[PDB]
Every structure is written in C-alpha cells, then in structure tokens.
Enzyme design. Structure first.
Site, PDB file in Angstrom:
ATOM      1  N   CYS A  15       0.808  -1.218   0.000  1.00  0.00           N
ATOM      2  CA  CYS A  15       0.000   0.000   0.000  1.00  0.00           C
ATOM      3  C   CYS A  15       0.852   1.283   0.000  1.00  0.00           C
ATOM      4  O   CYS A  15       0.488   2.286  -0.618  1.00  0.00           O
ATOM      5  CB  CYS A  15      -1.043  -0.017   1.138  1.00  0.00           C
ATOM      6  N   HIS A 120      -3.186   1.192   6.893  1.00  0.00           N
ATOM      7  CA  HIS A 120      -3.238   1.160   5.428  1.00  0.00           C
ATOM      8  C   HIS A 120      -3.009   2.582   4.904  1.00  0.00           C
ATOM      9  O   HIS A 120      -3.602   3.524   5.421  1.00  0.00           O
ATOM     10  CB  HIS A 120      -4.551   0.533   4.928  1.00  0.00           C
ATOM     11  N   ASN A 135      -7.120   5.970  -3.128  1.00  0.00           N
ATOM     12  CA  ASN A 135      -7.038   4.720  -2.396  1.00  0.00           C
ATOM     13  C   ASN A 135      -6.909   3.456  -3.261  1.00  0.00           C
ATOM     14  O   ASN A 135      -7.712   3.191  -4.156  1.00  0.00           O
ATOM     15  CB  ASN A 135      -8.271   4.617  -1.505  1.00  0.00           C
TER      16      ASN A 135
END
Ligand code: NA
Lengths: 181, 76
Positions: A15, A120, A135
């Site tokens: 991520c 995250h 995202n």
C-alpha cells in the site's frame, strides 16, 4: 472509469508503494527502492545506538528488535514514505502540525495528502480544481467535493487515523494537464 | 533549559524542558508543539532508547543536548 487518472489498484499489502505511485501519478517506486530506503533508515538508527558502544547491553538488545521501517509482513513506515518523497522535492508533515495549522491554509488549496487508516496507506490528491480519492482499495479514483475535504481529513482525531499533508511541486502528469483550466 | 530533538528525516525540533521532566512529559511536549502523538515517538540518547517513566536527569541530559527521534507508524 476515469481512465486518464493513474490508479494503481491494490496488490496485497504493497500500500505504501501504491500510495506513492498514485500521488506522483505513475510507476515511480518499486519494491527494491523501498526496501533500500528502509534498510538505510535502519542503518541510520543503528549508528545512533552504536554511540553507546557495540558491546553494551542496550546496543545488543536493540539488534534483537524488529525494524521500525520494514516489518516482517512487508509494511513500510512513515519514515520510508518521507524519504521516498524527498526524492521528488516533497516534504510531509502531520496535518495537525500546529505551525502548519497557524498558516490558515484552506485544505482545498493544498495539492496532496497521505492518510493512514488502521495501518493502510492511501493518497488523496487534486487535479485541476478537483479532489480525488486515490485509495488502492477502490475500484477506481473517486471525486471528493470541496465541501467534504476538510471533514475527511479531520478523521485524524480518531485513534485509527493519521493524516499527512504533502507540500511541494508534484511532478507533471497527463491528469493535471487534462483537468486544468 | 533548551534541548534539541533531531529526526532521521531532516527536522530538528527545539524544546524548552526541565531536568525533572519525564521522557513521558517530553513526548507530550513534542505532541503539543509538533502534533506527533506520543505513541509514534521513539526517543534515543547516547545509545539508549529512553524509557517513559524516567527523567532527563536520570539520563544525564543537559542544556544543548541532542536527542534523536525515530517515528513509529507503519502501513500495508
Ligand atoms: Na490520531
């Protein structure tokens, strides 16, 4: 949808890399680059600990501790994100930074933020006059309207969220050029 | 007295502290001043990770001393 926006979707747990790549708008960063950034940060910390002697109890106990920059699940830290951004002339600070807050900037007039929710990393950035959520856990880039942006960033106050503002001239990309006026 | 907190990423923070301040108190100052929450702070001086319950005095930290700030936050 929104194909002219670069949006690297989530491969497993990478991520940090998607966050940075999505902020800069291209395949800027690879696993080897980030692991090396973490390894050097680790070595920097070790050097600070060696100030006490490499034979001292404290030093030896430290070598038996996990990295704070790249853990055994492959998560990268805020320090690694920081150093990767410096490549590109970019600085990063907690959005709640009191000196930054005194500036009285309307968040709508920034250009990029990085958030950490429940471990995250995701990016939010502006193209032209429009804010997008980039995202990696999302089918695709999503508009965030100006009236919502500040409120979005205010999740900070929750234990779950840490929100960062990324200051500096981002590199040029087709999305900015297309959405400007 | 005045001490300095140098991060690994460029920024050095200048704090006003007292020798009887606990590492806990210092981390709370850093939160007040910089907005970095205490949980994300690892403080190092002279080769030792500093423990929250002890004082700058306990660590022999004096005016003009330089601590090191490692930030702890991961994601993914
Ligand atoms: Na928080």
């Amino acid at each position: 949808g929104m194909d002219f926006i670069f949006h690297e979707k989530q491969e497993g747990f990478l991520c940090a890399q998607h966050c940075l790549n999505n902020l800069l708008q291209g395949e800027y960063f690879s696993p080897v680059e980030l692991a090396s950034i973490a390894h050097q940060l680790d070595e920097e910390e070790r050097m600070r600990m060696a100030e006490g002697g490499v034979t001292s109890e404290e030093y030896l106990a430290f070598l038996q501790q996990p990295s704070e920059n790249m853990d055994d699940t492959g998560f990268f830290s805020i320090q690694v994100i920081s150093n990767a951004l410096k490549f590109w002339g970019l600085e990063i600070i907690h959005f709640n930074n009191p000196e930054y807050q005194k500036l009285g900037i309307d968040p709508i007039n920034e250009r990029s933020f990085i958030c950490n929710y429940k471990q995250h990393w995701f990016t939010i950035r502006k193209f032209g006059k429009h804010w997008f959520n980039l995202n990696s856990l999302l089918a695709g880039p999503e508009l965030i309207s100006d009236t919502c942006l500040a409120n979005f960033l205010a999740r900070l106050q929750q234990q779950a969220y840490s929100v960062f503002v990324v200051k500096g001239d981002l590199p040029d990309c087709e999305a900015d050029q297309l959405l400007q006026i | 007295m005045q001490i300095f907190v140098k991060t690994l990423t460029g920024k050095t923070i200048t704090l006003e502290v007292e020798p009887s301040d606990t590492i806990e108190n210092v981390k709370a100052k850093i939160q007040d001043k910089e907005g970095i929450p205490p949980d994300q702070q690892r403080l190092i001086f002279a080769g030792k990770q500093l423990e929250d319950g002890r004082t700058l005095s306990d660590y022999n930290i004096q005016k003009e001393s330089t601590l090191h700030l490692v930030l702890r936050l991961r994601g993914x």
